[PDB]
């Protein structure tokens, strides 16, 4: 009786669905590399 | 950015130099006393 319990289980385990997002890793480079930009850009500013 | 703005015009208050001529008074002070005799000249030439 227990089996039908864990064909929900087995589901359960299945459904997961968007997990890997790597280049979430590559907009957070985007936010890296840009964000990098602004810790430079006052200085642009401060040298001049 | 504004900052470099204001550069020029720290300069352009800093770049008068030749305001307080004071001894102007005193070339005008030539003026009144020699132009003082001005005033008097042909007066002598009156008494005579």
Do not use: C, D, H, W
């Amino acid at each position: 009786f227990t089996l039908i319990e864990l064909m929900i289980v087995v589901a359960i385990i299945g459904i997961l669905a968007a997990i890997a997002i790597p280049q979430y890793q590559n907009y957070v480079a985007r936010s890296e590399g840009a964000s990098a930009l602004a810790s430079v850009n006052p200085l642009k500013t401060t040298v001049e």
